[PDB]
RNA sequence: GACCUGGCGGUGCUUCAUAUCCCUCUAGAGGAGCCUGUUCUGUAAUCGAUAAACCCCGAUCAACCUCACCACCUCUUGCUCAGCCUAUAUACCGCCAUCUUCAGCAAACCCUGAUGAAGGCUACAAAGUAAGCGCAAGUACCCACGUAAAGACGUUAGGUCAAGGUGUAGCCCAUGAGGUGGCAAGAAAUGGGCUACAUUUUCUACCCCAGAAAACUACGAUAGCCCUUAUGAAACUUAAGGGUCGAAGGUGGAUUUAGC
RNA sequence: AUGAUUUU
């Protein structure tokens, strides 16, 4: 039925299942997580399967100084449009599947030795483009809470330096 | 394109009950009086029994027109309780609010 | 009239004047299942038969 | 609340007084008593038009004509 | 090129002395670009203020009386004054109205919203008449009261007849008048079986 | 209620983003809305079953699915008449041929109706020949169809056949004038001959006959001026009241592209006196063109009083509905506003500007130029920045003709400091418009006069640094600053005691 | 705990409007109804019909104007006239807005056999009442 | 328009009902809804048919959405010709 | 954060809209008040939301917008107040002034409530703590107790607000005269779903007509007659007045209580002021708010709960 | 080995619970009959809830329909651009339960612990400032009282794939659709409720001044049997009324519920 | 007096 339908957000929220008791105490793995895909990205208003051309929405309102009439693309032309849309979708999927190489630190999966880039500028027009920040240790410390039980927190040690004798560290 | 086959059967029963409705009324009028002869009344009983089953008005159930729920349906809006509450909470129903007194 | 309320919107969507997020979600999921390998068996094609 | 709705220009006497349609029906007997009840119900009915009110009477006349043999068994004569 | 820029609201072009009824001729949804009123609506947040008229859905959810300003109402009534007649001066009091028009007719019209306007409650017609006005002697008065039964209230000396059988209001009115006529004539008529009272 | 000035036309939305800015945008938005209505109607007609559910009481026939199909498929006269009513020209003629081959009789009225459909929308000639009996109605409609199809000689020949055996005479008059290119007197003699035929047949000429004659006489620019009055006297003698199209034909004929136009002035004066205080009704398809043609005469004669008489006649009662289509209303409003700016007090002209623009129409770039010229004549230059803001609102930001006129007018003479600062702000806004021209996709224009005026205004307002930036634009765009501009630069340098600036002015001057 | 039409708290960067930030118990106290009609009145009828029409109209407008509507719709009925008021964005061109408005009004008028009039109020962005 | 009018406020009506708060096995917890109908009666006396028709048309067209109107008539009539005297 | 320039723009917009609103309503723009603005807003934009702040409001920007203090540091960044680096300059400067006045006084030697905390925040703009409020009140009280000068008395009165002390004296119905000239008083009483209107004459034969029926016949229960005797017997006026009372709604006991309240209030127009006060202190002039409590869903009754099973 | 936090303690002290822990106050349940759920037994015959937080619960409700169960039979692009009340509530959206008859949850900063998990208060003040949610305040009913409503973050992988939608997995001559017929009971136990065991009662007039009955013809079934009536096409079955009979029950074991 | 094994 038409009324037994939901919106994109109402469907993706259920499909992704980000909430729930599973993702609260490490009861599920992150490997099988699926990412949300926008279905309104490549779609243009006025495009249909039948390939009708509506003046003012799908095609320009006036052509050669005259108002266009309602037209319909040929079967071959519509097949070309469908093939173009499929090719664009596959290219977009390929770009997402492309992986950007990241320089590893002391080890392949170790956060130590990885640079965090220049420090964030201060609110008073102060910049630290000369300084460089690198990570030394990332540790997941835990504490016990009455309600939630184990409480997970991240402790990170970093070091900043400019290369001219001025340097420091913080946690 | 209805919600389910149960709703589709209910629609068919309503359509077949809307038909044959006057014929049932006329025959049942003969059956529901003592003035007419008993033999004629018995023949009317045979005719109304021989009428199609789906034409019987008691086979119609007031299901939800949104989720095909056979129970928990308000007759004024023809909606199930869950759908009615969802619309009322969203505010899409005029003049309906939470009752506090 | 659920037949009217469904076919009319289906016609509008095929004419490019109505966008249905739910229908797009179903089509995308069906396409992904076909790519994964799980495709709807055709009528008369009995896997158990 | 009634614009665009006319019941063929019928009047109150046509809608109510349906005894003129019982000329075929016998004026005495249980059949007459039953038809008096039917006509009284049709006259009190506000949701029916004159055409369908006559149609109910026509159906009863046809049904009684078909079942005249049963009426003969029960010592009743129709038309 | 940059996206199309919305023009400044026409309230700036509007002057203080303006024909507001002309600005809002009929009932229209609230438009901040057309209403030169800095009206705010909405429950304020902590250390906040009610939301501005631009984008305020609450203002849009209010049936506005902009088209019904007092100046507009007076002007509309002045134009419509040509369409109205004058009540008779002789019927100054309700007693005189009752004296000249003993029969009163009551009917109800219903205004609804939606594609359909049909309403079965619009067929009811009520006819009230005082039996004192009717030319009734002792026999006719008593027979009429017995015939009508509870339809006549002795305290008010008023006979009330309600007709709803007829599908149309005009047919109900005709039936009500016909019932009153036959009741009056039969009440005056004397039958032999009445001697067994 | 009364007409409101700040509001846009009622057809458009009342949203700042949705309201049109220019006349071209106004036309495009209406066409887009009409396109949407056509698309919706096409969907309804293509799929009627989705809308066959009556829920409104009383019934609304217009809001119902449309059916234009020959339901009766049987080959019969009744179904043939149905297709004639449905105006299916191809189906009707094929069915008529099949009916004729079958041998069943066809009524004369049905045959005449088929001819009327074919003539308005060969096959018609073949059917006309195949008619066992050709009646005067069939001859008349065939002549009218030929005249509509520009077969004037064929129509005249058919009329000769009819003679051997009102609208017809109108077709004949058009046919005689258009088929041949003889002299005006010969065409007038042909018209008189047709009138003599009309008298012989006892047929009364009508308003359409008179309008067709006048438009045919209009084809001769000057030869048929006096005969137009003769036709007009004939109309009065018969008793036919002239229509707006009749007056439109008279003015377009009597008034020609000539210098004196003394008789044209007399004709329009008499027509306005004749039509003063009179309401009008639709009588002829050319009634709309009357007001635009009259306004053109008013603009040509430079008679604003006459234009106000035309405007007053338009606003009398329901005569405003005869203003005409969009192109007619644009021409009428533009000429009316231009004449107002030319021959009226500036204060009343501003009142007319507020009442008309933009409620009546979106002004053209030339109209805005004329308004600036009127302000220049009135020596009220404080409104020039306001006109620039109006031009930006109305879509005249990048025409570059108004920009040059505004800059030249502001920098023409010195002003009090308050007005000078306002002019400097307007010049900066125009400078930003030049920096953001949509024409920059092809080329960017920085006129030397525009650069000089902006720099002069900045210097007079005290924007010395901005003037140096303007000088940088001068050497960037290969434009030479004027001597007066250099003198102002030297004065500023001397005030600031800056020999470096003085050397800079000398260097750029050399 | 209740979770009926309530936008729960979050990190604090979630923008919400006035309608969606107010819980259903605030109806008729701090916010009004999104639809007005005489169906839900003592003695009146066709409440179910109005509800079905309102649901279809909201879904039809949502699909007809993808990425355009900012807030919910205000539906009003006066006799035979139907008024649909929407707050939309400005991303689309005015030609597309006018084309859809004309198409939507004509299609709905023929479908529901009543004069349907659509009004649009464009805003630069979605109005944020608060950040939950 | 010069019409004598009297306005009073009839008592309001509140229609309340209850529904299940949850979807399952939670009969105890309920959610209660209500519909409030406020009445306003305006009685206009001593007017003619033409004046009444104009007034009704004006108010009905200006009636805001979500408001229902019921107009009760009181028409004055004389005795019918047949009931003038007892012919029977 | 709202700047002063934004406030000025809102004030200008408010003035323009006020003149436009007066033009719309067809009244004099000069003699237009906030009440006139409120009436116009209510009529033009009718809102039935129970919370008033959710309705459309058009007031002055000063009242609508909150109050913010000016920036203490200028272009050079130097704060303008000596006690700026305390974070609560307004409070501490006020405490400094009070302490200074206390030193000066040492050298020299019902409706007034102390300022509430919330209004103290408004006066001092900056936020204060509960104990900060307590310390400020303590200093003001100590200042008031000490010998106050003219300036000190003015300073103390600055931080005080007037309180209207409502009197508990029972109102007296005006005495009316009937056709016969007899004096009488008319009053009303209300019990739970019971309403009674009583007309009590100054002099009479001690009769009490309830709905045209004598009391012993209308209320056969002795307790109801005890209720009717309570007012007159209390003021020692038993049998010296006549009462004609009509009661409707409720049970027999509710009707008796409603009549008792109506007669007692009507009798107050004939008894002395001390007797009126004594009746009020005896409970004869106070309406009883005890009414039937609504039943709640999920419960057998108002407070009664369903049977609870541990397992 | 020594610590941080939480939980727990038949762990100390102080104040405490206001239908509330005990001594107290009222009326009940548990024993009788009946109505209605559940557990076990039986048939060919659904499913779910099933400590507090299930048990007149999904149902503001089942002779056909509902029905999703079973037996038999019938149909194959199937009312649907299919369909599936099929397995997973331990993938979820959506409505909820409970602590809550709480008051805490905290973004963004700063400080302390030698820069460890972590902690951050003393008012005659000693490192905390705090946006926001909740509480509070407003709002609804008869007031400012009371009752509603509201009640965050989280716990119980709590309940709901059978309101509806949906991820994954499964079938497509069947785990889909339709027709006919049929079960939904009691060996036994138990939850909730109704009616009684009577004299502060039973019948009658009355709605509060009476007359009768009152221990084997007293009280007491809404139980059983027969008849009639109402709806329905279909009433041995649903309901109401009348007729017939007058059973257990004589204040209830351990235990337990609600009320300011 | 007791609370089956693996489940961050
Ligand atoms: K017990
Ligand atoms: K599932
Ligand atoms: K029990
Ligand atoms: K294991
Ligand atoms: Mg690796
Ligand atoms: Mg049923
Ligand atoms: Mg709860
Ligand atoms: Mg109780
Ligand atoms: Mg028991
Ligand atoms: Mg079970
Ligand atoms: Mg189970
Ligand atoms: Mg079955
Ligand atoms: Mg069954
Ligand atoms: Mg199945
Ligand atoms: Mg399992
Ligand atoms: Mg769960
Ligand atoms: Mg309170
Ligand atoms: Mg509660
Ligand atoms: Mg609260
Ligand atoms: Mg579980
Ligand atoms: Mg379970
Ligand atoms: Mg199966
Ligand atoms: Mg008993
Ligand atoms: Mg019995
Ligand atoms: Mg029966
Ligand atoms: Mg007995
Ligand atoms: Mg053991
Ligand atoms: Mg263990």
Coordinates of N, CA and C in Angstrom, one line a residue, chain G residues 19-129:
Chain G
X19 N 8.6 23.0 15.9 CA 7.6 21.9 15.9 C 8.2 20.6 16.4
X20 N 9.3 20.2 15.9 CA 9.9 18.9 16.2 C 10.6 19.0 17.6
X21 N 10.9 20.1 18.1 CA 11.6 20.2 19.4 C 10.6 20.1 20.6
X22 N 9.3 20.4 20.3 CA 8.3 20.4 21.3 C 7.6 19.0 21.4
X23 N 7.5 18.4 22.6 CA 6.9 17.1 22.8 C 5.4 17.2 22.6
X24 N 4.8 16.0 22.3 CA 3.3 16.0 22.0 C 2.5 16.5 23.2
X25 N 3.0 16.4 24.4 CA 2.2 17.0 25.6 C 2.2 18.5 25.5
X26 N 3.0 19.2 24.7 CA 2.9 20.6 24.5 C 2.0 21.0 23.4
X27 N 1.2 20.1 22.8 CA 0.2 20.5 21.8 C -0.9 21.2 22.5
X28 N -1.3 22.3 21.9 CA -2.3 23.3 22.4 C -1.8 24.1 23.6
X29 N -0.6 23.8 24.0 CA 0.0 24.6 25.1 C 1.1 25.5 24.6
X30 N 2.0 25.0 23.8 CA 3.0 25.8 23.2 C 3.1 25.8 21.7
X31 N 2.4 24.8 21.0 CA 2.3 24.8 19.6 C 0.9 24.3 19.2
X32 N 0.5 24.7 18.0 CA -0.8 24.4 17.5 C -0.8 23.1 16.6
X33 N -1.9 23.0 15.9 CA -2.0 21.8 15.0 C -1.6 22.2 13.6
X34 N -1.0 21.2 12.9 CA -0.6 21.3 11.6 C -1.7 21.3 10.5
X35 N -2.9 20.9 10.9 CA -4.0 20.8 10.0 C -5.3 21.3 10.7
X36 N -6.1 22.1 10.0 CA -7.3 22.6 10.6 C -8.5 22.3 9.7
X37 N -9.5 21.6 10.3 CA -10.7 21.3 9.6 C -11.9 21.1 10.6
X38 N -13.1 21.0 10.1 CA -14.3 20.9 10.9 C -14.7 19.5 11.2
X39 N -13.9 18.5 10.7 CA -14.3 17.1 10.8 C -14.3 16.6 12.3
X40 N -13.3 17.1 13.1 CA -13.2 16.7 14.5 C -13.9 17.6 15.4
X41 N -15.2 17.8 15.1 CA -16.0 18.7 15.9 C -17.3 17.9 16.3
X42 N -17.9 18.3 17.4 CA -19.1 17.7 18.0 C -20.2 17.9 17.0
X43 N -20.7 16.7 16.5 CA -21.8 16.7 15.6 C -21.4 16.7 14.1
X44 N -20.2 16.9 13.8 CA -19.7 16.9 12.4 C -19.2 15.5 12.0
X45 N -19.0 15.3 10.7 CA -18.6 14.0 10.2 C -17.4 14.1 9.3
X46 N -17.1 13.0 8.6 CA -16.1 12.9 7.6 C -14.7 13.1 8.2
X47 N -14.5 12.8 9.5 CA -13.2 12.9 10.1 C -12.2 12.0 9.5
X48 N -12.6 10.8 9.2 CA -11.8 9.8 8.6 C -11.3 10.3 7.2
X49 N -12.3 10.8 6.4 CA -12.0 11.3 5.1 C -10.9 12.4 5.1
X50 N -11.1 13.4 6.0 CA -10.1 14.4 6.1 C -8.8 13.9 6.5
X51 N -8.7 12.9 7.4 CA -7.4 12.4 7.8 C -6.7 11.7 6.7
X52 N -7.5 10.9 5.9 CA -6.9 10.2 4.8 C -6.4 11.2 3.7
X53 N -7.2 12.3 3.5 CA -6.7 13.3 2.5 C -5.5 14.0 3.0
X54 N -5.4 14.4 4.3 CA -4.2 15.0 4.8 C -3.0 14.2 4.7
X55 N -3.1 12.9 5.0 CA -2.0 12.0 4.9 C -1.5 11.9 3.5
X56 N -2.4 11.7 2.5 CA -2.0 11.7 1.1 C -1.4 13.0 0.6
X57 N -1.9 14.1 1.0 CA -1.4 15.4 0.6 C 0.0 15.6 1.1
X58 N 0.3 15.2 2.4 CA 1.7 15.4 2.9 C 2.7 14.5 2.2
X59 N 2.3 13.3 1.9 CA 3.2 12.4 1.1 C 3.3 12.9 -0.3
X60 N 2.3 13.3 -0.9 CA 2.3 13.8 -2.3 C 3.2 15.0 -2.4
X61 N 3.1 16.0 -1.5 CA 3.9 17.2 -1.5 C 5.4 16.8 -1.2
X62 N 5.6 15.9 -0.3 CA 7.0 15.5 0.0 C 7.7 14.9 -1.2
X63 N 7.0 14.0 -1.9 CA 7.6 13.4 -3.1 C 7.7 14.4 -4.3
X64 N 6.7 15.3 -4.4 CA 6.7 16.2 -5.5 C 7.8 17.3 -5.4
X65 N 8.2 17.6 -4.1 CA 9.2 18.6 -3.9 C 10.3 18.0 -3.0
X66 N 11.2 17.2 -3.7 CA 12.3 16.6 -2.9 C 13.4 17.6 -2.6
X67 N 13.9 17.6 -1.4 CA 14.9 18.5 -1.0 C 14.5 20.0 -1.0
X68 N 13.2 20.2 -0.9 CA 12.6 21.6 -0.9 C 12.0 22.0 0.4
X69 N 11.1 21.1 0.9 CA 10.4 21.5 2.1 C 11.3 21.5 3.3
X70 N 11.2 22.6 4.1 CA 12.0 22.8 5.3 C 11.3 22.3 6.6
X71 N 10.0 22.7 6.8 CA 9.2 22.3 7.9 C 8.0 21.6 7.4
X72 N 7.1 21.3 8.3 CA 5.9 20.6 8.0 C 4.9 21.5 7.2
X73 N 3.8 20.9 6.8 CA 2.8 21.6 6.0 C 1.6 22.0 6.9
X74 N 1.1 23.2 6.5 CA -0.1 23.7 7.2 C -1.3 23.5 6.2
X75 N -2.3 22.7 6.5 CA -3.4 22.4 5.7 C -4.6 23.1 6.3
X76 N -5.3 23.8 5.5 CA -6.5 24.6 5.9 C -7.7 24.3 4.9
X77 N -8.9 24.1 5.5 CA -10.1 23.9 4.6 C -11.1 25.0 5.0
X78 N -11.6 25.7 4.0 CA -12.7 26.7 4.2 C -13.8 26.4 3.2
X79 N -14.9 25.8 3.6 CA -15.9 25.3 2.7 C -15.4 24.3 1.7
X80 N -15.4 24.7 0.5 CA -14.9 23.9 -0.6 C -13.4 24.1 -0.9
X81 N -12.8 25.2 -0.5 CA -11.5 25.5 -0.8 C -10.5 24.8 0.1
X82 N -9.3 24.4 -0.4 CA -8.3 23.8 0.3 C -7.0 24.6 0.2
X83 N -6.4 25.0 1.3 CA -5.2 25.8 1.3 C -4.0 24.9 1.8
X84 N -2.9 24.9 1.1 CA -1.7 24.2 1.5 C -0.6 25.2 1.6
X85 N -0.1 25.4 2.8 CA 1.0 26.3 3.1 C 2.2 25.6 3.4
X86 N 3.3 25.9 2.7 CA 4.6 25.2 3.0 C 5.7 26.2 3.1
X87 N 6.7 25.8 3.8 CA 8.0 26.6 4.0 C 9.1 25.8 3.3
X88 N 9.6 26.4 2.2 CA 10.5 25.7 1.3 C 11.8 26.5 1.3
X89 N 12.8 25.9 0.7 CA 14.2 26.4 0.5 C 14.3 27.3 -0.7
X90 N 15.5 27.7 -1.1 CA 15.7 28.5 -2.3 C 16.7 27.9 -3.2
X91 N 17.1 26.6 -3.0 CA 18.1 26.0 -3.9 C 17.6 25.9 -5.3
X92 N 16.3 25.5 -5.5 CA 15.8 25.3 -6.8 C 15.5 26.7 -7.5
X93 N 15.5 26.6 -8.8 CA 15.2 27.8 -9.6 C 13.7 28.2 -9.5
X94 N 13.4 29.5 -9.7 CA 12.0 29.9 -9.6 C 11.1 29.2 -10.7
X95 N 11.7 28.9 -11.9 CA 11.0 28.2 -12.9 C 10.6 26.8 -12.5
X96 N 11.4 26.1 -11.8 CA 11.0 24.8 -11.2 C 10.0 24.9 -10.2
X97 N 10.0 26.0 -9.3 CA 9.0 26.2 -8.3 C 7.7 26.5 -8.9
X98 N 7.6 27.4 -9.9 CA 6.4 27.7 -10.6 C 5.8 26.6 -11.3
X99 N 6.6 25.8 -12.0 CA 6.2 24.6 -12.8 C 5.5 23.6 -11.8
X100 N 6.2 23.3 -10.7 CA 5.7 22.3 -9.8 C 4.4 22.8 -9.1
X101 N 4.4 24.1 -8.8 CA 3.2 24.7 -8.1 C 2.0 24.6 -9.0
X102 N 2.1 25.0 -10.3 CA 1.0 24.9 -11.2 C 0.6 23.4 -11.4
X103 N 1.5 22.5 -11.6 CA 1.2 21.1 -11.7 C 0.5 20.5 -10.5
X104 N 1.1 20.8 -9.3 CA 0.5 20.3 -8.1 C -0.9 20.8 -7.8
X105 N -1.1 22.1 -8.0 CA -2.5 22.6 -7.8 C -3.5 22.0 -8.7
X106 N -3.1 21.9 -10.0 CA -4.1 21.4 -11.0 C -4.4 19.9 -10.7
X107 N -3.3 19.1 -10.4 CA -3.5 17.7 -10.2 C -4.3 17.4 -9.0
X108 N -4.1 18.1 -7.9 CA -4.8 17.9 -6.6 C -6.3 18.4 -6.8
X109 N -6.5 19.5 -7.5 CA -7.8 20.0 -7.7 C -8.7 19.0 -8.4
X110 N -8.2 18.4 -9.5 CA -8.9 17.4 -10.2 C -9.1 16.1 -9.4
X111 N -8.1 15.7 -8.6 CA -8.2 14.5 -7.9 C -9.2 14.5 -6.8
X112 N -9.2 15.6 -6.0 CA -10.1 15.8 -4.8 C -11.3 16.5 -5.2
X113 N -11.5 17.0 -6.4 CA -12.7 17.6 -6.9 C -13.0 18.9 -6.1
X114 N -12.0 19.6 -5.6 CA -12.1 20.8 -4.9 C -11.0 21.8 -5.3
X115 N -11.2 23.1 -5.2 CA -10.2 24.0 -5.6 C -9.1 24.0 -4.5
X116 N -7.9 23.6 -5.0 CA -6.7 23.5 -4.1 C -5.7 24.6 -4.5
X117 N -5.3 25.4 -3.5 CA -4.4 26.5 -3.7 C -3.2 26.3 -2.8
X118 N -2.0 26.4 -3.4 CA -0.7 26.2 -2.8 C 0.0 27.5 -2.6
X119 N 0.5 27.7 -1.4 CA 1.3 28.9 -1.0 C 2.6 28.5 -0.5
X120 N 3.7 29.2 -1.0 CA 5.1 28.8 -0.6 C 5.7 30.1 0.0
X121 N 6.5 29.8 1.1 CA 7.3 30.8 1.8 C 8.7 30.3 1.8
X122 N 9.6 30.9 1.0 CA 11.0 30.5 0.9 C 11.8 31.1 2.0
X123 N 12.7 30.3 2.5 CA 13.7 30.8 3.6 C 15.1 30.5 3.1
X124 N 16.1 31.2 3.5 CA 17.5 30.9 3.2 C 17.9 29.6 3.7
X125 N 17.5 29.1 4.8 CA 17.9 27.8 5.4 C 16.8 27.4 6.4
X126 N 17.0 26.2 6.9 CA 16.1 25.6 7.8 C 16.2 26.4 9.2
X127 N 15.1 26.9 9.7 CA 15.2 27.7 10.9 C 15.5 26.7 12.1
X128 N 16.4 27.1 12.9 CA 16.9 26.3 14.0 C 16.4 26.9 15.3
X129 N 15.4 26.3 16.0 CA 14.9 26.8 17.2 C 15.9 26.7 18.4

